[PDB]
Amino acid sequence: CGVGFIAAIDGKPRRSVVEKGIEALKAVWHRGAVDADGKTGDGAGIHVAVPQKFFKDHVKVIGHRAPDNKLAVGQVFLPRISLDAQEACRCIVETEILAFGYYIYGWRQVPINVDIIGEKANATRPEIEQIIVGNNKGVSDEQFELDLYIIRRRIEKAVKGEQINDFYICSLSARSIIYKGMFLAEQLTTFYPDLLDERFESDFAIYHQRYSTNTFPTWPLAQPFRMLAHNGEINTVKGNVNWMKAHETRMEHPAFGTHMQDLKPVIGVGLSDSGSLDTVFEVMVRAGRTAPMVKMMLVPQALTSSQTTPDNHKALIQYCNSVMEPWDGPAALAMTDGRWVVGGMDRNGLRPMRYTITTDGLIIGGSETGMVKIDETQVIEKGRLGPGEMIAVDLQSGKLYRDRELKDHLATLKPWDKWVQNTTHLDELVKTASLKGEPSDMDKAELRRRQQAFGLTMEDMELILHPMVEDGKEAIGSMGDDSPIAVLSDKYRGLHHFFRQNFSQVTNPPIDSLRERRVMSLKTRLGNLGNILDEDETQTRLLQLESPVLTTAEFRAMRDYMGDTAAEIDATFPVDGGPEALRDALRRIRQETEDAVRGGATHVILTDEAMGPARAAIPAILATGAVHTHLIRSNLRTFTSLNVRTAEGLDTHYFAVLIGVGATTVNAYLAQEAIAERHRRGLFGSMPLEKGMANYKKAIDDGLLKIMSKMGISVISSYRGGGNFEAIGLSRALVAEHFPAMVSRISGIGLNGIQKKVLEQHATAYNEEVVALPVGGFYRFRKSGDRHGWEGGVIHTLQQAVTNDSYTTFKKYSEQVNKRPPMQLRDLLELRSTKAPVPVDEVESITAIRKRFITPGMSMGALSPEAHGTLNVAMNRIGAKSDSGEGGEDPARFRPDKNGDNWNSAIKQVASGRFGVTAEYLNQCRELEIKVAQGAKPGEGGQLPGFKVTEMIARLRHSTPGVMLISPPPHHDIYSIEDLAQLIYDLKQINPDAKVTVKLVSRSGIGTIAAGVAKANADIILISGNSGGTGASPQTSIKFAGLPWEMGLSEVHQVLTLNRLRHRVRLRTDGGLKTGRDIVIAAMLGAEEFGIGTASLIAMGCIMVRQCHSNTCPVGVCVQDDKLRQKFVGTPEKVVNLFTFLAEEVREILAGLGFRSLNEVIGRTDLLHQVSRGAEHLDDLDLNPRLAQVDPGENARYCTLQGRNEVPDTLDARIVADARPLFEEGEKMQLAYNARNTQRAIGTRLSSMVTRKFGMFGLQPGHITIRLRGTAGQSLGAFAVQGIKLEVMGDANDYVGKGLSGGTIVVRPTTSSPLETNKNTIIGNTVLYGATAGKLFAAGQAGERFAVRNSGATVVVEGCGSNGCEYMTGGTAVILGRVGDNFAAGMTGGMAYVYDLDDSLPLYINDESVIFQRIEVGHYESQLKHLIEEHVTETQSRFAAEILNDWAREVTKFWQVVPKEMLNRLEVPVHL
Amino acid sequence: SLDAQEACRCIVETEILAFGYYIYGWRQVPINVDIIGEKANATRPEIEQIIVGNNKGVSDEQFELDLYIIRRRIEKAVKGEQINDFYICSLSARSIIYKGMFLAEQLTTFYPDLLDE
Amino acid sequence: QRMLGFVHTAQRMPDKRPAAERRQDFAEIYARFSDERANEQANRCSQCGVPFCQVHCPVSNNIPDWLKLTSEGRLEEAYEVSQATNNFPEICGRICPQDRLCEGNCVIEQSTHGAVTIGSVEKYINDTAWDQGWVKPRTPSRELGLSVGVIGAGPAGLAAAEELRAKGYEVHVYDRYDRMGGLLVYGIPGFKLEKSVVERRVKLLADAGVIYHPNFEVGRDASLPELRRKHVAVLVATGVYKARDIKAPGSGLGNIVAALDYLTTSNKVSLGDTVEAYENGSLNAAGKHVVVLGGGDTAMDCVRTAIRQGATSVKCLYR
Ligand SMILES: Cc1cc2nc3c(=O)[nH]c(=O)nc-3n(C[C@H](O)[C@H](O)[C@H](O)COP(=O)(O)OP(=O)(O)OC[C@H]3O[C@@H](n4cnc5c(N)ncnc54)[C@H](O)[C@@H]3O)c2cc1C
Ligand SMILES: Cc1cc2nc3c(=O)[nH]c(=O)nc-3n(C[C@H](O)[C@H](O)[C@H](O)COP(=O)(O)O)c2cc1C
Ligand code: SF4
Ligand code: SF4
Ligand code: F3S
């Protein structure tokens, strides 16, 4: 994977550009996916300029006369199987080109070499040809390009008319050409030998290679595209296509003319995200703008509210943000207009981009700093690209614009200042809105009768609403979800329960909303859409809101401002209408809306205040969805807005789905009425009503940001109307008709069931006297409320059976479990074989089955030490595996005790926080595990309350005792699938024996991701369910996130069997397993190993108190207190008996069916049938999508290989061959080698050998030293231990010093380089991620997110970037230069010194948890002095030497940054 | 692709239910792939059946006419969104068609349903 | 405050009167909580999911809900929630054996931290509602034109009567004794259950609109077909009164009395009526040696009411 570009600055063609482009493509084979075939690739492409001399010579040879003006060439992919569709395509192309009047010279067959393509990329290979078109009309060049663009668009439309397949036009221009295909990266100049000619010379070049997630290549999907090249992924593609459909109905420009009609569906069908973004980019460029302006408009910068940028740029970005919705996602872009050549980044800066300027007037940018070979004595400046930055080259003038210079040159075209001031705000109107006209609050009886009509219980106001008004933050739950799914219940579950939220797996990282909050906006605009192809003042005249949610006073003020332009629509249907009253009401409202919009109205208010004893209220979700979809399909949405007044919104999940469906603003008045009525009774204490409303709105805003952040979307504008949810339990027809773009894998209730539920609840509310709301059980069990998976009798029976060791009692327990009405998806399935029963004593032995169960990870922060030790003792006794979870483990238990117990854990986890990951913690296991997402809370980090962190856990995690620890939602290491492959390579290098497990969460589209991670050499996939327990997490994330594991597992199995990849990995599942029937069902679906989890805790004494977070669990399971931990009653015999009973039940079932092994039943789907609940529920659930049986072929239906998937050997092997006297005698050594950027994990296997031999601290510092010269690759010296010293002369790419554990790394420029050390980037991104001890001295500027999750390391660098020292927990760090924005975000341990000259640190720092001062104590000056002296000694810098020379006057320039939590814990206080 | 299947199913279900008939469900036809060659297997489609019942009590000729119109409109719709490899071998309450790209004598082996009594 | 105080408090029931003082009188032995101590003892509950305190309560009261609404003042809403699902909450809190139904199963009892005093808090938050006029009769809104009859004035009879009258019907009770209330007024003694709250609840029922038929035997003064023809439906709640016996050498001697008649005479004398079996008869135990047979709470009440009236030596024989 990788994108890059090369450009001659002066703008003159030369062969060296293409030569270096090919050389750079020849050296990216290590980031791609290898194959056992060796010939199969997954895409490659290059994009260069047209060599006029070549084609003019060809035309001369044919017999024509070479024209004077530039010649045009187009490359086409025609069908290959049928020799008639080729002629039809040729006829179409020729009759369309000759329609404008241009002259066709002829066709040419591109010479190729097919002997190097694989077997699958060759069966779908198209026929490649070129067409030569000359400009005989003498028209200009820009008009020539415009005509060629229009010709290509109309040709595409025409060939799509007659339904001809396998036709593509890779490029059609007179300036540039594209050579791309589905071959290997290094085999490009072999498949296309034309590039070996001496006449292919250009002044720019772009190159790209991708990393696919499936194994069915399609040639028209490889990059680069026409005028773009993208590396990464776009989050909002289902949300941007809709707004593009809405914008298409008004855009026009006088350049195209009548042919504008042939450009209406600008985004075709069957493209990828990088194809859609490219199409819109090109249609915006061809209309007059230039590449920098289009990049600024499509992918903007972070509109920070700071004074570090001039307000000229602020006005510019304001206009660009007001004109168009952003296109989010991790993205490195390398685009090229006809004139400019631009390289840019996204808002967050997740992908890397590094460039280099030479003295030959050459700029080279890419993903790595060692792709092309350049001598050090000829470079001028090395650099990087921050978040939102860009660098451009102007070829027509021959100039190089860096970031700020390009911004200044771009901010001089139009007077944006006089245009932006046309906007108006709302808080001003709320202030000028006189405090009169406050209506009367509804009576208690009316309030109760309106609340009963929606099913609101008394716990909905005493558990999840009181915290919002009281503190301003959502609630916290402490256990998994055990409630029935929405469609299988019998009470009234609102329509907002059928929609589960989404998140992002390894293919996409989430965003931290607690620290990186400065790049997330909740702005709203009314009266915004217009023609996006002009430049005027009417585009910046609108109403602007700072939040989509509104109170009642703000809504009344907005209504008064709107006046007679809005239209109020009723949303009620008659209760006595009939069996189809809801459908008629939907049709009525969706016709009245269209009738009112055409009549000049520009605001649609969807009010349902008319709910009475004879009119039921339509669910707001369905109504707003119908209205928005109808306005989209009728070319009217761009005219008006859509404001909703709902009477059901109480929590942050309702507003989320209302805004995701398409509503603009949402006002919830019933919640405000309840708040006022609870305040007038004197329940909140002494706070005024305004304080309650402010806290409630703040809680709603933070909840919206948290929900929107689980996906990677950082702006509300590009998230609205995109449908980022999943419908479970709804009909396919209803979903496909009323909702824009959502998937409903299994069907559900239609409109009749919804009408029945609504009418029944409304009758219950309005036909009987209500005296008080029902108590209600949804989060806690109550006799009146719903049913639960864990009830009293079940728990007591299980505990008695496990304690007394009686199989009959456990069978009674399993019967009680399997006799309740259906509550999950696996309850509607039934086992039915056709063989004859076999005697029970013939099936596999109980041991051979117990060795298939494991216990999932439960961190030592959540559990007590005794419970963790008990589980680990029990599992290591029967032969199966256990898990330690995050939070590390105690090293003293790394040995069997005197009695014979083994308190260790056979599976170590690698969480997001890297909480205890060291070099010895990884060499004491048999299987590693990469936790991407948890079952309960997906796309979010695990939490740990403050008081739960005692001194023991503080020492165990290397943190501060008594402070809340929240892991970051992303990994900062896994930003794409190639990053996951790199991390797997690192983990397989540090431990030469373990197997790498990847943990996922079931959802829609998990099959492609699982097929992707299977190519990354992982051998175990884990599919967690939506019902998994947890130690602490919010309620909205527990109840409304995830999917049942039956969908994810059954999809992953099918997708892996389809790609011939199932026979290499093992599948594992967990979440909601209680009896053996569920185990057999999961084995039938495809799983092979099983995780138990919560049931284990119930065998040891847990009684589902659900108070784990409050640190007062009675039985003492999840507590850190002493007097409660004295109440532990656990015993390993209990867990052993539980596992024994569970295995015996599976033996019984297998004997009853007629098989003799779990191998004979894995994958055999035909033994499962679906039975309906009856003829009174009428739910149309069809489970056939999960019962589909793909035929495997000649391979088996499970893993049939031993050992791990091996990886290619790195440089370390050679080192192990040489440093033999170190391992045989223990003597100092000294080695020197040559480093290259295609050599990953330099010095990790040696670290494993040293850790196994001497230990982490057995050798003196600097026992073995290695000297490398050149550009080191990725993960330089990951997980190195004390005694290893790597010294690099040159620069390292990425992840340098990851997981350092006492080693030493020194990076310095070469001796023969004319470069200032403090003005050139030397290391890359994510430096010292989660290190625990050691040193690192660099002699340049670091990259992005410098020293994240540092715990014990001491680093000295001469610069930094954005988000430096993010969430640092311990150690010291000196920075001799400028820093980036959001410095020291979430820092909670350690100390920092910054050498700041221009007095600008108060403008960049995030003064939330840290304080910055001047150095005042000599005890702290001696530390800095010694640190800088050691830096000068090691790296031999000149800037640091200059600082040390003038010490007395430069000591007064340093800023000392100290956390707030370490102000009363330091020995020597920092103050006087 | 496991997504175009869902789009096709959505189209079929939203078009059949547009007239008012009652859908009983889908069924996966049991087959035996071990007898097809190498080229007739690389382009093999997924074979399924849909069961539709006449709840409106309409006559049989009108039932056949409605089924014909439904099939025509489904074909037009699925051709609208440019989805490939979709076909409706038959849709009626009178007759059914079992066809494929196997050998002539291997028919009752690929489709074992015809071995039923 | 956040009610998770089972960690830094200790269970303590309300104040009990010493043994040297209980033997004399016939009043109760416990006392109502003080507000400062009830507000603290109700703060101990853990507000646990899957509340075992509710699973094992035959009426299934929402114990955590009013246990919470008590710890924050707001006693009116707590009384409302408690009364919404149990007709006689004070009688229940006074006599329900809690060591096997409610105080014997909640999560902090299995953990040997001591159990929440549920019955005493029930008594507290239900008796303090009388002291402020919060209790009101449940008169039917719209008078319905039907009549229902019930046989018996015990707990089941009174509960069914209150529910039927709240529905809107018209009810007629039929009791054998002269004072209605079942063996709550004649069987259970005066130290366990005070005879004032019983008549208070019965007077509230009478105010609701029920009709009382005292001194009316269903066997003598009427017949089942007659009452069947009178109303639309009749509810047999006559209870159980045929006592067991023992046949052994000497089972025909004098001063061998049954327990129910003894308890009835004791309750009558505690009310008055100067029954002659107390003055000159074997139903007094002033200075005699008493021995009771059989076990259970019946024998407990008998032995206690015997040791109350002097009874120099009393013994109990259980098998
Ligand atoms: C803490 C506690 C203590 C207890 N103590 C005792 C005790 O000391 N003694 C004891 O016996 N039980 C005792 N019990 C038993 C318990 O009270 C009973 O289970 C409960 O009272 C049953 O009441 P009931 O609905 O049967 O009505 P009962 O209380 O049995 O009253 C039934 C009513 O029907 C009337 N009746 C009876 N026959 C006729 C008829 N032929 N015609 C008309 N009316 C008729 C009776 O006079 C009475 O009014 C005790 C229970 C508890 C929990
Ligand atoms: C108290 C507790 C702590 C947990 N900690 C972790 C954890 O640290 N990492 C993790 O991946 N899963 C964690 N889990 C989830 C379990 O690993 C597992 O996915 C879940 O318990 C399965 O749910 P089940 O027991 O109902 O089958 C935790 C679960 C609980 C209840
Ligand atoms: S009574 Fe017991 S089970 Fe019920 S809430 Fe209190 S502690 Fe929990
Ligand atoms: S004391 Fe009250 S709450 Fe407890 S079991 Fe008896 S009636 Fe139920
Ligand atoms: S659910 Fe949690 S609060 Fe205690 S009783 Fe079990 S560990």
PDB file of C-alpha atoms in Angstrom, chain B residues 108 112-117:
ATOM      1  CA  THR B 108     -31.241 -35.896 -11.196  1.00  0.00           C
ATOM      2  CA  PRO B 112     -31.983 -34.377  -6.050  1.00  0.00           C
ATOM      3  CA  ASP B 113     -35.462 -32.934  -5.411  1.00  0.00           C
ATOM      4  CA  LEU B 114     -36.735 -34.731  -8.516  1.00  0.00           C
ATOM      5  CA  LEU B 115     -35.874 -38.038  -6.827  1.00  0.00           C
ATOM      6  CA  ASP B 116     -38.710 -37.425  -4.361  1.00  0.00           C
ATOM      7  CA  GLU B 117     -41.933 -39.409  -4.643  1.00  0.00           C
TER       8      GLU B 117
END
